[PDB]
Amino acid sequence: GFLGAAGSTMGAASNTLTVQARQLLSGIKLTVWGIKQLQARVLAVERYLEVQQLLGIWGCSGKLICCTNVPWNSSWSNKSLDEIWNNMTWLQWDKEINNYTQLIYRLIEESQFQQEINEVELLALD
Amino acid sequence: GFLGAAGSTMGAASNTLTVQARQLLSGIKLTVWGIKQLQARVLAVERYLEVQQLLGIWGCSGKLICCTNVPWNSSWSNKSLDEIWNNMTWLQWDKEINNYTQLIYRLIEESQFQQEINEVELLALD
Amino acid sequence: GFLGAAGSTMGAASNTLTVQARQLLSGIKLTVWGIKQLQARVLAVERYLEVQQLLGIWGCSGKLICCTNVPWNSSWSNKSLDEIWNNMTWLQWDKEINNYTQLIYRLIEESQFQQEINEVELLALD
Amino acid sequence: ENLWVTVYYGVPVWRDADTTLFCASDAKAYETEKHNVWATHACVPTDPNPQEIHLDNVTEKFNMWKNNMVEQMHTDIISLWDQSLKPCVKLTPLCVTLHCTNVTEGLKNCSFNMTTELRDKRQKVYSLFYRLDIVPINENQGSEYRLINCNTSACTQACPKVSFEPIPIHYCAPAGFAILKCKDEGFNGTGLCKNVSTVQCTHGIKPVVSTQLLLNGSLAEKNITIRSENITNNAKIIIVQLVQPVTIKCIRPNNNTRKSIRIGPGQAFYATGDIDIRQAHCNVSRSRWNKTLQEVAEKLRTYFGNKTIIFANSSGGDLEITTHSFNCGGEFFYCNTSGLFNSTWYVNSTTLPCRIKQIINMWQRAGQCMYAPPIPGVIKCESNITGLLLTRDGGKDNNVNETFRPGGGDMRDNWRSELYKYKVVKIEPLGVAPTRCKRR
Amino acid sequence: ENLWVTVYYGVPVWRDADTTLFCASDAKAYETEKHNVWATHACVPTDPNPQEIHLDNVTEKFNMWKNNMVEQMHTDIISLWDQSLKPCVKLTPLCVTLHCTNVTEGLKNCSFNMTTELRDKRQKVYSLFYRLDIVPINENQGSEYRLINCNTSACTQACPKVSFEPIPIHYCAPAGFAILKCKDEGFNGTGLCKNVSTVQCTHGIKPVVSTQLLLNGSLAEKNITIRSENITNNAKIIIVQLVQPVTIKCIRPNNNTRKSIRIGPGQAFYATGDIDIRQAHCNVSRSRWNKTLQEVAEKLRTYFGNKTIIFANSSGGDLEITTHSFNCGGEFFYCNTSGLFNSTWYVNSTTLPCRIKQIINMWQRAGQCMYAPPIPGVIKCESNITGLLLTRDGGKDNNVNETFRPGGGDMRDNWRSELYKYKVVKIEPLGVAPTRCKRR
Amino acid sequence: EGLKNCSFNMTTELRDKRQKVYSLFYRLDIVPINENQGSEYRLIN
Ligand SMILES: *[C@@H]1O[C@H](CO)[C@@H](O[C@@H]2O[C@H](CO)[C@@H](O[C@@H]3O[C@H](CO[C@H]4O[C@H](CO)[C@@H](O)[C@H](O)[C@@H]4O)[C@@H](O)[C@H](O)[C@@H]3O)[C@H](O)[C@H]2NC(C)=O)[C@H](O)[C@H]1NC(C)=O
Ligand SMILES: *[C@@H]1O[C@H](CO)[C@@H](O[C@@H]2O[C@H](CO)[C@@H](O[C@@H]3O[C@H](CO[C@H]4O[C@H](CO)[C@@H](O)[C@H](O)[C@@H]4O)[C@@H](O)[C@H](O)[C@@H]3O)[C@H](O)[C@H]2NC(C)=O)[C@H](O)[C@H]1NC(C)=O
Ligand SMILES: *[C@@H]1O[C@H](CO)[C@@H](O[C@@H]2O[C@H](CO)[C@@H](O[C@@H]3O[C@H](CO)[C@@H](O)[C@H](O)[C@@H]3O)[C@H](O)[C@H]2NC(C)=O)[C@H](O)[C@H]1NC(C)=O
Ligand SMILES: *[C@@H]1O[C@H](CO)[C@@H](O[C@@H]2O[C@H](CO)[C@@H](O[C@@H]3O[C@H](CO)[C@@H](O)[C@H](O)[C@@H]3O)[C@H](O)[C@H]2NC(C)=O)[C@H](O)[C@H]1NC(C)=O
Ligand SMILES: *[C@@H]1O[C@H](CO)[C@@H](O[C@@H]2O[C@H](CO)[C@@H](O[C@@H]3O[C@H](CO)[C@@H](O)[C@H](O)[C@@H]3O)[C@H](O)[C@H]2NC(C)=O)[C@H](O)[C@H]1NC(C)=O
Ligand SMILES: *[C@@H]1O[C@H](CO)[C@@H](O[C@@H]2O[C@H](CO)[C@@H](O[C@@H]3O[C@H](CO)[C@@H](O)[C@H](O)[C@@H]3O)[C@H](O)[C@H]2NC(C)=O)[C@H](O)[C@H]1NC(C)=O
Ligand SMILES: *[C@@H]1O[C@H](CO)[C@@H](O[C@@H]2O[C@H](CO)[C@@H](O[C@@H]3O[C@H](CO)[C@@H](O)[C@H](O)[C@@H]3O)[C@H](O)[C@H]2NC(C)=O)[C@H](O)[C@H]1NC(C)=O
Ligand SMILES: *[C@@H]1O[C@H](CO)[C@@H](O[C@@H]2O[C@H](CO)[C@@H](O[C@@H]3O[C@H](CO)[C@@H](O)[C@H](O)[C@@H]3O)[C@H](O)[C@H]2NC(C)=O)[C@H](O)[C@H]1NC(C)=O
Ligand SMILES: *[C@@H]1O[C@H](CO)[C@@H](O[C@@H]2O[C@H](CO)[C@@H](O[C@@H]3O[C@H](CO)[C@@H](O)[C@H](O)[C@@H]3O)[C@H](O)[C@H]2NC(C)=O)[C@H](O)[C@H]1NC(C)=O
Ligand SMILES: *[C@@H]1O[C@H](CO)[C@@H](O[C@@H]2O[C@H](CO)[C@@H](O[C@@H]3O[C@H](CO)[C@@H](O)[C@H](O)[C@@H]3O)[C@H](O)[C@H]2NC(C)=O)[C@H](O)[C@H]1NC(C)=O
Ligand SMILES: *[C@@H]1O[C@H](CO)[C@@H](O[C@@H]2O[C@H](CO)[C@@H](O[C@@H]3O[C@H](CO)[C@@H](O)[C@H](O)[C@@H]3O)[C@H](O)[C@H]2NC(C)=O)[C@H](O)[C@H]1NC(C)=O
Ligand SMILES: *[C@@H]1O[C@H](CO)[C@@H](O[C@@H]2O[C@H](CO)[C@@H](O[C@@H]3O[C@H](CO)[C@@H](O)[C@H](O)[C@@H]3O)[C@H](O)[C@H]2NC(C)=O)[C@H](O)[C@H]1NC(C)=O
Ligand SMILES: *[C@@H]1O[C@H](CO)[C@@H](O[C@@H]2O[C@H](CO)[C@@H](O[C@@H]3O[C@H](CO)[C@@H](O)[C@H](O)[C@@H]3O)[C@H](O)[C@H]2NC(C)=O)[C@H](O)[C@H]1NC(C)=O
Ligand SMILES: *[C@@H]1O[C@H](CO)[C@@H](O[C@@H]2O[C@H](CO)[C@@H](O)[C@H](O)[C@H]2NC(C)=O)[C@H](O)[C@H]1NC(C)=O
Ligand SMILES: *[C@@H]1O[C@H](CO)[C@@H](O)[C@H](O)[C@H]1NC(C)=O
Ligand SMILES: *[C@@H]1O[C@H](CO)[C@@H](O)[C@H](O)[C@H]1NC(C)=O
Ligand SMILES: *[C@@H]1O[C@H](CO)[C@@H](O)[C@H](O)[C@H]1NC(C)=O
Ligand SMILES: *[C@@H]1O[C@H](CO)[C@@H](O)[C@H](O)[C@H]1NC(C)=O
Ligand SMILES: *[C@@H]1O[C@H](CO)[C@@H](O)[C@H](O)[C@H]1NC(C)=O
């Protein structure tokens, strides 16, 4: 499985996922290059821990292909799943979708990964 | 939702959770501030990583509101669920409960997240 | 529960787990100790993180005794589960299995955690 | 009715923290080389917006004294000085024979032999000094003085491009640590503050060096404010912060200038070139101050009961401490605070002269003298006075006349001046509770 | 029956590492600016309790020779020396014309010109030197000597407030790494140790400044102990650790004193004030050593067969190596070890004089001389010899007389002394096994 | 042309003797100290 490969249409692109995930975290007296290494590792680690933190409040840091019933809001792009998986492509998709994403990166953290035990109240308590 | 909010009673306080979780992780040559930032980010990262490790061995890093059938030991405060979620409040709760907490912060890692495949042995092996 | 203890046979050893897991993360102007502490914590942080990344793509970071339907390949060892839990021992077991480990540490990231929603496609989409 | 252990994650639980803290500000130019000792963009400009929120109902005990931050900032500022001075000159050749002359009082007029840019040629070179820069070498002789440090310590001149000018710094707590702000002026630093908030980074503290009188610090409201570790320890510090501002505009009345001499090839020393000569002075008209102090005394009597009270001068101790003292621009003042603290305060129906100095022993360290640059200017201070480092007399004079002197008791306390409102804490996201459940 | 891949997390599996290691100890004062060369509390006092645990049946191959810690400590401790000396004086104002004289042997009595606190006035100043501090400038003349470094190296004197006194450091491993300890004395550092344990941080290891004889490191049990990379390489080092200690109480018998002279204005050099004058000495009584060595010989015979054996002097090589050498207080010794290694060990039915030095070339570095502070004291050592850097004669000379000389061939091996018992490892939590299951 | 042959006084390893020492310089290493004189150049820095 390759790294990058975003011109693979989005479903076929997902024939690869986890090798890119490894690239998120590993490359696959004081002194100048030593302080640069230290700073670099921390920035990569802290950025890596931010997306794992997203995969906390989004859920799915376990199941690394993610489910919620959060609404796909029809104010976003109406592009078909058929176009998306089999003709359209990741960089190009984010460059279409980013104008919506600051909604989604909060509206995603709904009850399923923000409030659902407040609903388990009715399942398990009287 | 706000940050902090401990004076909301513990159930209503839980109307906020995930935003405080973000605050655990990001604020929402040598040079003197440079080394201090580098130390600071590492301490935050490791401390944030210490509670993810707790959410490992306690379970529930995959589900940031948590379940186990571990005993609520009646040697602890007998305060009612009704009082707790609807009149009591998190600082004022921990400052009543800390005396017990170290027991829980070990006894919580019972078999459900500490041993249970040793029991899935009975479920899946002859 | 002790640290280490690999000479307890692999099942009896697994009477303990999570206390060894804490040891993965905490020990339970400047002089050289100041910069070496900072380097040290980051290498541990990265390492702790690297294995959590494995427990992403292998799954099971949410259930720290792990399951998959991935093949046990008969080219590795035909040694019995009976031998393994009750007579064999972790260091001596890795000194048998290391000759295969690099195969498994990729082959384990089969679909169950690497791809499986591509299969949930048939479960949930027409 | 059964119960189990349950956990809610990220719930607000917090405790006092021995944690590290880090700088932010507005960006002054984004340039890493922007001329400054405090925060030359080496301090990261983390969000200048104080994104604070109400701790509605959140009752907290504050602790101005066992606070980490005082010691942290104190250690910090001293490190800022070192890692602003290492970038510029050590004056290791400057302790040398100084000859001096007397001119219209205590601004001494002087010349000396030194290395040029060449480590062979002597050069005769010329500078003013304020008398308090020098001491006699062995005897009362016209050629025989040394700089006041040389006796035990080495000096370092900072580039005029290391401006000591107090740009505020915001301390951020790093994430998983947080700041609690006592959200009232009607408060003293120990016990409960009933109204409160949280901040990721503090409102700019204002690290004006300050020696006895709090410059530049924010006002109170409702009443004048008084703060101390323990008021029954008469010897240890009393901080005042005022409900009313006061303002001072001290001046060097003398047309005095940079003279630049190479003392070694990389090493530009700033000698002091002259223009009649008059003592440095200040204007703060008495009656505003007087009736302010009349209320300061009343707030103090709200501890002590109905005493007549005096504010009296600091005396006998080191001039570095016993004057009120501060920077303006990049040059340092040592004012005979007596004229503003020689005053009396009954119960019933009720301007400084100053010395300039080029050498300072800042934070009272051994070694590591700073020779401040002589600023090129008829220098003008333009600043607020807003609070007092008082001391109450060791005269436990049995309920009659108990009284005060201002002091430079700790430069930590010159920061407590603002740090009092901020309590730094760890969040522990570990919400163990009873409820019921079974695993999914 | 069928099987799948499965993983247990965090089960015990480990391998050797290039991993970094960090300090712990007790806190001596919690002052960040303490008087100490090894740990000014900038070494974090990670738990002083060794929370060690059994490795019952855990058969771990050890390797004292491919161990990372020797090289790491060698680097770390050299870093500490520089980080203790950078704060204190370099002695560029000291390599100069020295005039000297002879007095009751080779503690030369001397004077020189130098800069004072002022970069103009020559001061004539006076000090003792031990003869091995100096060399002649060009020719055999009374005015014509220089300090022994100046030929190729610059000197630097630590404040007497940077004690070399050996406070132990405990090496912690970072988390996800650990120390394995051979839980036996009846062991040598290569191959299996059958009885073992693990700890996060090494039990106390003395920095052990040592040069030839292991001082201060602990004793064995069951037998005297021998360690080598390869015993058949007669040239490379042999280490001994004894079952029994011997104590040595070396002395400067001369009442000699700190003379502080200013050498630049922030810079303080410690010249050496005098009181009869006698050679440095070490009381140890022969027969305890003699019959201890008779067992060292018997342990060694287990490798070689029934030889009569000799321990003989180090000779001919640089005095910095070829004398036994160590600190007391802050001042260093170089002793004629011959008097304790000039001895014979049959099979059949079978105290030193010393030179002080004010200069040392520690770790055999180019540059970076230490002029050790001459101590204000009749210095007394109160310490244990416990082991030997032996060297067996390279001349193979077989079947008659095979024999040894003490050496100092690498100060890495002066640390190997105690390090042998510790193996530093990564833990890999990656427990692949067969089992069988289906996802929940 | 433009490779000047030069000598100067300096300290040695002793902080006393003005050792007379010798070096070449390519001309662009130096400038005149004040005036067009054979003893009177400084390093261009
Ligand atoms: C807090 O104490 C501070 C000193 O510790 C006070 O800060 C500044 O101190 C300096 C030196 O004493 C003063 O003098 C100069 O001021 C000018 C100001 O230029 C700006 O304003 C003019 C219009 O008035 C405008 O034409 C210019 O373009 C600038 O926008 C500076 O250029 C000089 O470098 C030098 O700073 C300052 O006046 C004084 N104040 C400020 C804001 O700089 C400070 O005033 C004290 N603050 C309080 C609240 O007490
Ligand atoms: C390992 O080698 C070390 C030296 O390399 C030995 O440590 C110490 O070395 C110094 C200098 O040679 C000795 O001299 C002085 O000792 C006094 C002792 O003060 C303490 O004891 C008295 C009572 O005896 C007590 O009243 C005091 O409060 C102190 O508790 C110190 O004040 C001096 O600073 C200086 O250290 C030491 O005697 C010597 N021993 C110790 C334990 O300090 C060390 O002995 C060697 N250890 C082994 C196992 O061989
Ligand atoms: C901080 O705590 C206070 C209470 O100390 C909150 O104010 C009010 O608290 C009551 C708690 O019972 C909330 O329920 C109300 O109770 C009254 C009877 O006491 C009832 O008549 C009302 O119909 C309601 O059930 C009440 O809503 C709440 N009112 C508000 C919004 O002020 C306060 O809200 C808490 N503040 C925070 C954390 O924002
Ligand atoms: C005490 O202050 C005086 C006045 O600044 C210093 O004396 C001499 O000052 C003049 C500047 O006024 C320097 O230059 C000379 O100026 C006159 C015109 O005023 C001009 O006719 C001459 O050709 C020359 O340029 C003069 O160099 C300076 N003298 C010295 C010794 O530098 C005096 O230096 C101060 N006293 C001490 C002890 O430094
Ligand atoms: C700069 O250096 C020169 C020499 O290069 C200094 O000249 C010296 O000045 C003194 C008078 O101040 C001359 O008189 C003699 O002084 C000694 C010591 O005080 C005294 O014992 C004698 O009786 C006599 O008065 C001295 O001959 C003269 N030359 C030398 C080589 O010392 C000059 O004073 C220095 N100037 C500055 C501004 O530093
Ligand atoms: C304003 O400051 C005071 C302290 O100046 C803060 O609380 C007070 O703290 C002191 C010392 O902890 C307490 O005083 C001691 O009380 C005992 C018992 O009566 C007495 O035996 C001792 O001699 C001593 O006086 C004091 O009780 C305590 N309470 C009060 C109301 O002052 C206070 O939290 C701060 N309050 C505000 C609104 O800023
Ligand atoms: C000292 O008093 C003067 C007024 O005499 C203050 O202003 C400065 O005055 C000087 C002349 O004394 C000015 O220099 C001249 O400026 C013109 C116009 O730019 C130029 O063509 C001439 O060649 C000459 O340089 C100077 O510009 C003026 N301003 C400054 C900042 O020096 C002066 O502020 C007082 N001294 C100090 C150090 O503040
Ligand atoms: C060799 O060691 C001797 C003895 O320490 C040094 O000789 C001279 O020592 C005396 C101090 O004992 C210094 O001051 C003189 O002391 C006597 C009393 O002892 C007193 O009567 C005198 O008035 C005077 O104060 C004297 O300065 C010192 N001699 C020198 C040359 O400085 C001698 O310094 C040592 N040798 C060398 C080459 O330095
Ligand atoms: C400290 O400095 C002074 C000078 O300020 C030194 O005085 C010099 O001492 C020497 C004898 O040691 C005198 O004799 C001459 O020495 C040269 C070189 O060895 C030789 O070629 C001549 O034949 C003659 O013997 C010399 O005249 C005298 N003055 C000077 C200017 O050199 C003093 O010795 C120094 N003392 C110390 C302890 O460093
Ligand atoms: C104590 O030390 C010895 C080594 O001093 C440790 O094991 C021994 O290691 C040597 C070198 O690796 C082995 O020697 C070589 O053996 C081969 C095969 O017999 C021979 O051809 C070579 O000439 C050479 O002698 C030696 O076999 C090996 N094993 C033993 C049992 O000595 C030993 O692990 C350490 N033991 C303890 C209890 O500390
Ligand atoms: C080192 O080994 C050598 C050689 O085996 C030992 O040297 C010999 O030591 C004896 C005393 O044990 C010396 O005897 C003395 O000789 C003097 C001068 O005639 C006499 O006055 C005494 O009564 C006594 O007999 C002997 O000279 C010496 N021989 C040689 C060749 O050096 C030595 O003892 C061993 N130990 C040390 C610390 O050197
Ligand atoms: C060198 O031998 C002396 C004995 O003479 C050792 O003890 C020190 O002796 C000096 C006098 O030579 C003592 O100074 C005196 O102390 C008393 C009481 O403190 C005071 O009244 C006198 O005015 C004078 O200061 C000194 O206290 C004493 N102890 C020390 C630590 O110096 C000395 O230990 C031997 N020298 C060295 C460097 O060890
Ligand atoms: C090293 O330093 C010595 C001095 O310690 C230099 O010797 C001096 O050299 C000059 C010529 O270059 C001699 O002539 C005189 O120069 C003055 C100053 O311009 C002039 O006014 C006189 O008319 C005369 O020409 C001088 O006598 C001589 N000695 C001294 C004590 O100055 C030497 O040249 C230097 N060498 C190097 C290579 O740097
Ligand atoms: C160490 O391994 C030994 C075997 O090396 C364990 O010893 C016994 O192994 C038998 C297997 O039949 C067990 O029944 C015994 O229970 C084990 N010994 C005992 C008494 O426990 C030994 O326990 C393991 N050591 C530890 C880890 O304690
Ligand atoms: C990109 O799309 C083209 C379709 O023309 C395809 O042939 C090519 O292999 C794709 N490359 C990938 C998989 O990124
Ligand atoms: C004081 O200064 C004047 C010049 O202003 C000078 O004539 C006189 O000699 C000086 N006197 C003393 C004692 O310094
Ligand atoms: C300072 O205090 C002393 C009394 O301690 C007093 O005599 C003096 O006049 C006061 N003022 C000054 C300017 O010294
Ligand atoms: C030896 O020292 C004496 C004083 O003890 C002195 O008189 C003599 O000149 C010295 N001789 C040499 C060659 O150092
Ligand atoms: C050192 O060894 C040599 C033989 O190499 C011997 O002659 C000499 O006496 C020994 N002792 C000393 C102090 O040189």
Side-chain angles (χ1 to χ4, degrees), chain C residues 48-93:
Chain C
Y48 173 76
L49 276 163
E50 180 58 59
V51 307
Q52 293 297 116
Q53 162 65 22
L54 296 172
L55 289 170
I57 71 192
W58 305 2
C60 310
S61 41
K63 288 183 166 65
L64 302 172
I65 319 174
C66 187
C67 173
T68 181
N69 69 1
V70 167
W72 183 261
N73 189 304
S74 302
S75 70
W76 304 339
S77 177
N78 203 22
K79 272 190 170 73
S80 322
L81 299 189
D82 172 42
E83 298 169 81
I84 291 161
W85 308 136
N86 197 37
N87 208 15
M88 317 290 92
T89 41
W90 274 105
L91 288 160
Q92 159 273 346
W93 177 259

Side-chain angles (χ1 to χ4, degrees), chain E residues 96-99 111-114 122-125 143-144, chain F residues 17:
Chain E
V96 79
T97 296
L98 308 174
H99 297 198
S111 177
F112 53 103
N113 292 323
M114 184 41 58
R122 271 74 287 281
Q123 55 182 8
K124 185 163 58 180
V125 286
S143 56
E144 300 310 303
Chain F
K17 282 284 183 180

Side-chain angles (χ1 to χ4, degrees), chain A residues 5-109:
Chain A
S8 309
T9 69
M10 304 247 294
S14 189
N15 299 343
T16 62
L17 294 173
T18 51
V19 193
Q20 298 92 333
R22 290 173 173 259
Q23 205 185 13
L24 308 174
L25 190 277
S26 182
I28 181 164
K29 293 180 181 176
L30 78 102
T31 301
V32 58
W33 284 125
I35 221 78
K36 296 277 166 164
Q37 281 170 214
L38 182 68
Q39 180 66 260
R41 284 184 184 292
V42 168
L43 177 57
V45 153
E46 182 140 359
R47 275 199 76 224
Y48 173 73
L49 270 163
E50 171 79 330
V51 307
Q52 298 287 112
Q53 156 68 18
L54 294 178
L55 294 173
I57 71 185
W58 301 0
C60 311
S61 48
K63 293 176 168 65
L64 298 177
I65 320 179
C66 190
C67 171
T68 180
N69 67 348
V70 167
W72 182 271
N73 184 318
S74 312
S75 66
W76 311 343
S77 175
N78 196 30
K79 274 193 172 65
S80 321
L81 296 182
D82 184 38
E83 304 168 60
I84 290 164
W85 309 133
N86 206 36
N87 206 18
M88 310 296 165
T89 51
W90 273 108
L91 287 163
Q92 165 274 303
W93 172 262
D94 185 277
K95 287 256 58 182
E96 172 162 320
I97 292 294
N98 69 94
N99 304 73
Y100 313 125
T101 55
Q102 196 62 12
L103 297 177
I104 315 190
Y105 297 170
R106 300 188 174 211
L107 296 174
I108 187 165
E109 48 169 295

Side-chain angles (χ1 to χ4, degrees), chain E residues 109-137:
Chain E
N109 181 21
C110 305
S111 177
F112 53 103
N113 292 323
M114 184 41 58
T115 195
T116 197
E117 40 95 35
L118 313 173
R119 285 293 188 153
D120 50 10
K121 253 289 179 185
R122 271 74 287 281
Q123 55 182 8
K124 185 163 58 180
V125 286
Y126 136 87
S127 187
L128 272 50
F129 294 86
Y130 319 110
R131 182 56 158 199
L132 309 180
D133 298 334
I134 56 165
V135 295
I137 269 168

Side-chain angles (χ1 to χ4, degrees), chain E residues 6 47 114 140 220 240 262 273 296 317:
Chain E
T6 50
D47 187 13
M114 184 41 58
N140 296 268
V240 181
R262 311 200 69 68
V296 183

Side-chain angles (χ1 to χ4, degrees), chain B residues 46-123:
Chain B
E46 187 143 356
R47 273 204 70 230
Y48 172 80
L49 267 170
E50 184 61 271
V51 309
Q52 298 296 108
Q53 164 68 12
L54 294 174
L55 290 172
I57 70 189
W58 305 0
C60 308
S61 44
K63 281 186 170 67
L64 304 179
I65 325 177
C66 188
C67 174
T68 178
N69 70 350
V70 165
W72 178 267
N73 185 318
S74 300
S75 65
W76 308 343
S77 175
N78 199 30
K79 277 201 173 69
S80 316
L81 300 189
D82 174 46
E83 304 162 52
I84 289 163
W85 305 130
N86 219 48
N87 202 20
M88 315 289 83
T89 39
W90 277 101
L91 290 165
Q92 164 278 328
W93 172 256
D94 195 84
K95 290 254 60 183
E96 165 174 326
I97 295 295
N98 65 95
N99 301 81
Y100 319 119
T101 52
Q102 193 69 8
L103 290 87
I104 317 192
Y105 299 169
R106 294 192 173 177
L107 294 172
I108 189 163
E109 49 175 320
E110 250 271 25
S111 302
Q112 311 81 1
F113 292 105
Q114 191 241 124
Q115 314 186 346
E116 213 67 355
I117 274 57
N118 193 81
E119 320 310 306
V120 180
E121 185 178 276
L122 183 62
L123 187 60

